[PDB]
Design a protein around this nucleic acid. Structure first.
Ligand SMILES: Nc1nc(=O)n([C@H]2C[C@H](O)[C@@H](COP(=O)(O)OP(=O)(O)OP(=O)(O)O)O2)cc1C=O
Ligand SMILES: [Ca+2]
Ligand SMILES: [Ca+2]
Ligand SMILES: [Cl-]
Ligand code: NA
Ligand code: NA
Length: 325
DNA sequence: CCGACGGCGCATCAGC
DNA sequence: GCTGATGCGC
DNA sequence: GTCGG
């Protein structure tokens, strides 16, 4: 963690711009700079040494100069003191409360955790579940627990239909020792880019996972994305495991590699790769890679591997463990 | 200097 | 009810 | 906030 101070500071500036300012491009800009600094294999000794990185320009260079000299950033010392900025930042930590709803609660005087618990009737369903598990969701999942969650998920899916393949992606597939939550990619041969030969393909799996008391709450559910809550079984006289966020994404079976690339991330890796893809005249989503001609997407190029996606844009292959940008 | 910034699923809302 | 925009999430 | 054209 050679430049942890700097990247914490940038992440905190990024969170401010997203949550308070509602400036999503400064948020991405700060997070890109944070990202490029975190992989820099030297202890940064000045801002001008940092401005040499792509994504670090003049404003951030000055902030890194200030931070190296004093150990803090007055722009951030002030944000920390503004009670309104601090209240809005706190409320966005509840899942389903975003920058707009956070600023709306503050106008009403709902600014603290006790205020939300007294005003549950002002929360939609997602927000209510986010409040319900606010502290559990703050906790990280050790890989050992993700391994048990994987075993349960894969075994329960095989009981529904042995032709399902479920793949755990996200930071787990990149090899992190701990994860924010669980992300499961789901395929079945009945669902392709050409046909849906069976309805309820995601519902049945969700239903089955609810039946064994693994999934405990539904934040949102449609025909290809589930977002909810799960929890490992505990033993006799044992404290319960914290409840965990789980996302299941059903993806057409012939689009697996584009989906698994998407769902392995990281989010910033996906941003840099899809940005670079544009520069090479392609567009990438979780289904296909397509050429650009007028700037309009052409037809899906053939993809047989994650590597074929990298090839098209003239990137050497990067294993999942080296995509934690 | 300036346009452009990755791409999309689900929930909710306005307007018809 | 649908359609498109907005909010919030991955 | 940053950057390539
Ligand atoms: N904006 C995003 N764009 C993306 O393409 N994604 C893709 C890439 C991610 O890896 C994956 C899962 O999302 P998650 O939020 O779970 O990220 P993880 O990488 O798994 O990190 P932890 O769970 O905190 O360990 O979805 C996520 C975004 C979220 O902000
Ligand atoms: Ca995750
Ligand atoms: Ca997730
Ligand atoms: Cl597509
Ligand atoms: Na730079
Ligand atoms: Na939130």
């Amino acid at each position: 963690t050679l430049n942890g101070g700097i990247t914490d500071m940038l992440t905190e500036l990024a969170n401010f711009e997203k949550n308070v300012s509602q400036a999503i491009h400064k948020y991405n800009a700060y997070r890109k700079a944070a990202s490029v600094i975190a992989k820099y294999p030297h202890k940064i000794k000045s801002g001008a040494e940092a401005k040499k990185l792509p994504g670090v320009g003049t404003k951030i260079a000055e902030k890194i100069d200030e931070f190296l000299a004093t150990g803090k950033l007055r722009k951030l010392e002030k944000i920390r003191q503004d009670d309104t900025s601090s209240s809005i930042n706190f409320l966005t930590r509840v899942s389903g409360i975003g920058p707009s709803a956070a600023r709306k609660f503050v106008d009403e005087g709902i600014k603290t955790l006790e205020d939300l618990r007294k005003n549950e009737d002002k929360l939609n369903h997602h927000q209510r579940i986010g409040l319900k598990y606010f502290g559990d969701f703050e906790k990280r999942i050790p890989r050992e627990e993700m391994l048990q969650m994987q075993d349960i998920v894969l075994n329960e899916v095989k009981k529904v239909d042995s032709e399902y393949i479920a793949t755990v992606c996200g930071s787990f597939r990149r090899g992190a020792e701990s994860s924010g939550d669980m992300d499961v990619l789901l395929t079945h041969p009945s669902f392709t880019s050409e046909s849906t030969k069976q309805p309820k393909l995601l519902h049945q799996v969700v239903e089955q996972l609810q039946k064994v008391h693994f999934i405990t709450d539904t934040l949102s559910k449609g025909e290809t994305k589930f977002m909810g809550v799960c929890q490992l079984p505990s033993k006799n006289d044992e404290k319960e495991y914290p409840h965990r966020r789980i996302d299941i994404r059903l993806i057409p079976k012939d689009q697996y590699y584009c989906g698994v690339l998407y769902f392995t991330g990281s989010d910033i890796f996906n941003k840099n790769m899809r940005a670079h893809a544009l520069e090479k005249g392609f567009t990438i989503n979780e289904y296909t890679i397509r050429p650009l001609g007028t700037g309009v997407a052409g037809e899906p190029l053939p993809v047989d591997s994650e590597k074929d996606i990298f090839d098209y844009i003239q990137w050497k292959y990067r294993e999942p463990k080296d995509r934690s940008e």
